[PDB]
Design a protein around this ligand. Sequence first.
Ligand SMILES: *[C@@H](C1CC1)[C@@H](C#N)C(=O)Nc1cc(N2CCC(N3CCOCC3)CC2)cc(F)c1Nc1n[nH]c2ccc(O[C@H](C)c3c(Cl)cncc3Cl)cc12
Length: 300
Amino acid sequence: DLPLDPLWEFPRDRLVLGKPLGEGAFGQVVRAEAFGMDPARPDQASTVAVKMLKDNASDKDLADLVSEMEVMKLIGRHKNIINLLGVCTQEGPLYVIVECAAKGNLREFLRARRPPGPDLSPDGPRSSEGPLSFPVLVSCAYQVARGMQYLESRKCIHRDLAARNVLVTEDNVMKIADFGLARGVHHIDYYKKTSNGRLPVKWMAPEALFDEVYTHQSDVWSFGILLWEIFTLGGSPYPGIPVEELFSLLREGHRMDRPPHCPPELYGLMRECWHAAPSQRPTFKQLVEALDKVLLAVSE
Ligand SMILES: *[C@@H](C1CC1)[C@@H](C#N)C(=O)Nc1cc(N2CCC(N3CCOCC3)CC2)cc(F)c1Nc1n[nH]c2ccc(O[C@H](C)c3c(Cl)cncc3Cl)cc12
């Protein structure tokens, strides 16, 4: 009943819905198998993610999903974002089909790969060597920056950039997810805590939190927070600080401390991202180039 866009339209009967990945404020995400996503290979199988309305479905829910779908189309394709693959709008429920990232989000990726503590017994030549190395952590930060740079060039503001919203592929490629969401910026529950204990207010730029102003520079603030997440190996920002205390600390200009085992180069970038004046924060272009220098210097 929605208009037909043969460019993106995909036969729903070529989808086999599987296990649900989670829910959102609007819609739910389900893992699914797709057959012939590449029209040159009609019978080949691929794993995809399918966005769809819940049965909570109001019209505002539908409008938001349609809104997200159309944003996806216009943004285009990039290596470091979750790309649109197709849509199902004819003769059935609305499906928005996007890419699969095998390893989950960046936060859980890092937390599951924290080095072994002093408690597990040494076994082998690499008992002290954890999965995560410094250049790979820098690469993760660099890829997110390039992804955001692309989104910025396409006039897209994420408004909730975080490690939880960055997905990891089988080849450890960072892919920014949920960049085109209507997040209800005029009614945000600042005290809201997610089912996994996340307080999304801790990623908000001051101008976003206090003035409801969003720019690409407000995303840069969030990227600084994400940087802190990465080099704390998936740690929660502002440790032990409730939302009420966050408000007053931010008004006092409080900033997070330099995390352990984090070089000054990267904490420097964090503080730059957290400058009070949005124009005094680096652009994503500058972040990409800054992170590239570090990355190239440690990839001999
Ligand atoms: C690839 C995706 C097409 C489905 C697929 C494979 N293989 C996959 O499942 N990818 C994936 C899985 C997960 N999980 C993390 C939670 C975990 N549960 C089982 C263990 O105990 C409880 C937790 C298994 C499932 C998270 C992921 F982010 C992905 N990757 C992924 N790829 N494309 C996605 C599209 C949307 C999406 O949204 C969900 C709601 C999401 C979750 Cl579940 C977590 N963090 C962020 C987001 Cl956006 C995830 C997508």
